[PDB]
Amino acid sequence: VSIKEIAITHHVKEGHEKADPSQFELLKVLGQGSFGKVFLVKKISGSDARQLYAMKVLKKATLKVRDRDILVEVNHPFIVKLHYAFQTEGKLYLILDFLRGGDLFTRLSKEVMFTEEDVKFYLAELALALDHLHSLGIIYRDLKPENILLDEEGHIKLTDFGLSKESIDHEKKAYSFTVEYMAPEVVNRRGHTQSADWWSFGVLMFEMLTGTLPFQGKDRKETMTMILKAKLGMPQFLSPEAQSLLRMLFKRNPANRLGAGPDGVEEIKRHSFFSTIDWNKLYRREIHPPFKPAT
Amino acid sequence: APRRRPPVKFIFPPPPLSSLPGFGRPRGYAGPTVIDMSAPDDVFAED
Ligand SMILES: Nc1ncnc2c1ncn2[C@@H]1O[C@H](COP(=O)(O)OP(=O)(O)NP(=O)(O)O)[C@@H](O)[C@H]1O
């Protein structure tokens, strides 16, 4: 059951030059997260001079790993890559890939009308990224649409890789208190298991295909009650393959959930829903995304 | 042709769940119908 906390203090490609605040120039604010604003920075020194990066500013960040650098191992085709990490004046600075494709939910909203096969492509790339973190013992924990971005080519890019973060004092909230994608065990505070991510995966699949969240409440308290006790009627516009995957994913006992069996993620890959996906070609980014961002 | 799918639009930077209690949202699929609060292991009722 062993869990190890790795504090994120400094990072740079092995044999490369470590970065510091003077080497970046701020350009704009990319977006607003729970832990603060995300910035666009331009490297002004070194071999990657003129390159654009995304920057997060935190008090500290740790990576919880259960069961080569971990920051290098988490590198994946569909996960943001951390290029630099440095600490200054009691603040942690994360230099990340600048994701130029925008978020998936805005792209889907721009289309308005799309097919299940369109959403299938993004879910499949999302599934590979989640399993890669699972393979190294990392849990995504708090998977939400804000973390699901696209790159210039239109491929999925997760904005984080399971980091446990603490915001700076300026961003600090008075009450720490998102439950909509949380698994029942998480609501029960029974522990966050790797099957919890596949529950969050299912809620995203439901929301992307239906446009609505499966459990809707007025406040945090009510929605938590719905996650634990609600029985839902399957939307009938969904395909039989999609309904089957949702039913296998939406099981309140973690052990009954798809992906928690002995084969693990290949349970989900082999499902009837993802039948049209060539997973190896998908990993090689040789399958074109349904929508290109530049349009 | 596959089964007719609903028009899907999202609000990015989703508004917080706590706020906006009675504000109506634009017309789309209302959501899954809650058949009961039986707390069954299988969230979806079998067809
Ligand atoms: N690498 C990036 N490139 C471009 N935009 C980014 C990047 N990372 C984050 N953003 C933008 O900033 C928003 C917030 O990022 P996010 O990773 O969700 O922040 P956070 O601090 O981890 N809080 P949260 O995701 O709610 O737990 C995203 O929805 C994007 O719009």
Author numbering:
A (entry chain A): 45 to 111, 119 to 228, 231 to 348
B (entry chain B): 23 to 69
Article passage:
The Kaposi’s sarcoma associated herpesvirus protein ORF45 binds the extracellular signal-regulated kinase (ERK) and the p90 Ribosomal S6 kinase (RSK). ERK and RSK are key downstream components of the epidermal growth factor (EGF)/Ras/ERK pathway. RSK consists of two kinase domains connected by a flexible linker. To understand how ORF45 forms a complex with both ERK and RSK and causes persistent activation of the two kinases, we determined the crystal structures of ppERK2-ORF45 and RSK(NTK)-ORF45 binary complexes.
